[PDB]
Amino acid sequence: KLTKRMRVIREKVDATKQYDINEAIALLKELATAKFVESVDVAVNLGIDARKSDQNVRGATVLPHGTGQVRYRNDKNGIIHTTIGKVDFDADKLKENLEALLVALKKAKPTQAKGVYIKKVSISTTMGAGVAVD
Amino acid sequence: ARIAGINIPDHKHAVIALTSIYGVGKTRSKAILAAAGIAEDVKISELSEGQIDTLRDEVAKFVVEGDLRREISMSIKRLMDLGCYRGLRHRRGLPVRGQRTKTNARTRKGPRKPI
RNA sequence: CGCGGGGUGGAGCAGCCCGGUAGCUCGUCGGGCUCAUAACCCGAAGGUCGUCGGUUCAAAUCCGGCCCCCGCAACCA
RNA sequence: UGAGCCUUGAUGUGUAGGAUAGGUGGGAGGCUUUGAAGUGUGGACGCCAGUCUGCAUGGAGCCGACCUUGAAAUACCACC
């Protein structure tokens, strides 16, 4: 069923367990496997669900590294799927980019929000697997 | 196609297109084509919008379109101001010729209305 | 005060979850069938759903605010 | 035997459109004799439609950035 490309991707990423940013971004840079330059795809699930109307968030962020001005809006399943920048960008810079997005997200959090704000934070590339961030 | 009148006649049999034009009946259509001389039995070839130029001037002798409507409006407003029985039927949406109102006056009064 | 339920045609009740533009029951009015009445049958009208916002291509439907009613629990200036 | 929940596949049919357009993002490359649409064929969602699926045939082509369309390829990666 799975092709050799997909089985080697799941051999490279063991997503059943969580990872810290330094290891996660190293995996992302080694996950960069395509003819064309890929773009980082964010995979962050929020405990808060935009299913409550007042808990919706609209925000903006300017990134010095760039992608550099990005916008974001929560969907109904309460998930965040943005792009911090291109994959060839250095890991340490990419780690600062995602960190600034996360700090803006904490400002975006409403008081009405109940339970964990950020349920899980994960990273993936165009065809890459999801690596959890700690 | 277009004519001197504001409304535009359809491209089809010339007599039928004129019947459709407001103010000009089928018989009046035949009156001006008798003067114009344009019959449908002539060569269909060489037919153009330029040809109706003669139609523009001859129809203008007959009040049609807006001119007739203005006449209809002045005739009915006079009826209303006169205070005559004819005007009153116009005001109440009732038969204006003496037709029975008890039954069969739907076209004048309108849809059936519950008691 | 906390939690749960309800308000939709004159009335009553669905539809709600799982958004797809709203029905039924009974009544009303008109006709039919019958010697007549009921039953029955046909047609018609009636609210866009307690209200107000948000969301969305779109809300009775989903999430809040408010009003009223109800159930249970809570209440040592 | 119920619930939470891990994983695997399966499963979405308001509609102009080709069709069985659930929400979002990266996103013109995925795929490929080691078998492209499709066939036989066995079932599934079954709304009886699009797909998937034990094996074989086909011998390489598929999704199209064309249209339609709030909304696009639903090609490619995750969750609900």
Curated annotation (Swiss-Prot), chain A:
The keyword Transcription does not apply. Keywords: Repressor, Ribonucleoprotein, Ribosomal protein, RNA-binding, rRNA-binding, Translation regulation, tRNA-binding. InterPro entries: Ribosom_uL1_bac-type (IPR005878), Ribosomal_uL1 (IPR002143), Ribosomal_uL1-like (IPR023674), Ribosomal_uL1/biogenesis (IPR028364), Ribosomal_uL1_3-a/b-sand (IPR016095), Ribosomal_uL1_CS (IPR023673). The keyword Nucleotide-binding does not apply. Disulfide bonds: none annotated. HAMAP family: Ribosomal_uL1_B. NCBIfam families: rplA_bact. This is Large ribosomal subunit protein uL1.
